[PDB]
Amino acid sequence: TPLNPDYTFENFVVGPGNSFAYHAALEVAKHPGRYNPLFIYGGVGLGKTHLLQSIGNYVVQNEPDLRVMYITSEKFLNDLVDSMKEGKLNEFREKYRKKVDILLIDDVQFLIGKTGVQTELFHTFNELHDSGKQIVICSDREPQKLSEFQDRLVSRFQMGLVAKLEPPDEETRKSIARKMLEIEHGELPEEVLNFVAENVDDNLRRLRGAIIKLLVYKETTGKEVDLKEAILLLKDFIKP
Numbered sequence: 540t541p542l543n544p545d546y547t548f549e550n551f552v553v554g555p556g557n558s559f560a561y562h563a564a565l566e567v568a569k570h571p572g573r574y575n576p577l578f579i580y581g582g583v584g585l586g587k588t589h590l591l592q593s594i595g596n597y598v599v600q601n602e603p604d605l606r607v608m609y610i611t612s613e614k615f616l617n618d619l620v621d622s623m624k625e626g627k628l629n630e631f632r633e634k635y636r637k638k639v640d641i642l643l644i645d646d647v648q649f650l651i652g653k654t655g656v657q658t659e660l661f662h663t664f665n666e667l668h669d670s671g672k673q674i675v676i677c678s679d680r681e682p683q684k685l686s687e688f689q690d691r692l693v694s695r696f697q698m699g700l701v702a703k704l705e706p707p708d709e710e711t712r713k714s715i716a717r718k719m720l721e722i723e724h725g726e727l728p729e730e731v732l733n734f735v736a737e738n739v740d741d742n743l744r745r746l747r748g749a750i751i752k753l754l755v756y757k758e759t760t761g762k763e764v765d766l767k768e769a770i771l772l773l774k775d776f777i778k779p
């Protein structure tokens with residue numbers, strides 16, 4: 540269980556664009572099994588991984604007596620492959636079924652075309668579902684918009700909670716920016732953060748990136764960071 544400490548509900552700032560997703564996740568984490576499965580989806584850097592692992596962490600702290608599994612569709616891929624090569628499907632099925640109560644799968648757009656894996660995932664799904672094991676899937680695209688995907692799988696995705704994340708507004712971004720800071724224990728002029736929060740509006744991966752970037756600079760350059768400085772430093776985040 541190598542979940543990321545930062546990815547918790549506590550470090551997740553809520554807002555109009557990610558509230559429902561947030562609650563679905565929290566609700567499911569409080570009642571693993573009551574809503575199987577949860578399918579969160581949204582563009583890049585919008586909270587998918589973070590939300591998904593929070594469910595993980597939250598359950599680890601309240602249900603320590605549970606086998607929580609976080610994985611990547613890709614790893615699910617690479618894991619099967621070896622299973623086929625090394626010739627050990629059992630080792631695999633025991634690992635992704637037998638020994639898991641809750642299974643969290645990130646970025647499932649990696650299985651597009653991979654109908655081989657798609658099929659295996661399909662049953663893994665069904666077996667966990669027939670035993671009340673919570674399933675959570677994250678995708679950068681909605682069930683219906685997943686190209687080259689077995690309808691039977693896609694049908695497994697919609698048969699439960701299906702939340703959507705959308706980019707946050709300036710106000711919410713700023714609060715996220717502030718929360719990102721704490722996590723990194725950094726600090727910034729209540730005018731630089733504002734500038735960053737307002738112009739690094741793609742995804743939250745980059746927003747934090749900038750916030751890290753400066754901090755790394757405020758590191759070397761023993762002195763602070765004035766507005767003008769940050770603007771040159773953050774040139775690949777405003778018009779990348």
Ligand SMILES: Nc1ncnc2c1ncn2[C@@H]1O[C@H](COP(=O)(O)OP(=O)(O)O)[C@@H](O)[C@H]1O
Binds near residue numbers: 585587588715744
């Ligand atoms: N609602 C939020 N509140 C605070 N931080 C957030 C929020 N959403 C995303 N983040 C930050 O962005 C990062 C996660 O981006 P991520 O969820 O992995 O993008 P994606 O979902 O496309 O994989 C985390 O490190 C987290 O600090």
Ligand SMILES: [Mg+2]
Binds near residue numbers: 587588
């Ligand atoms: Mg992700």
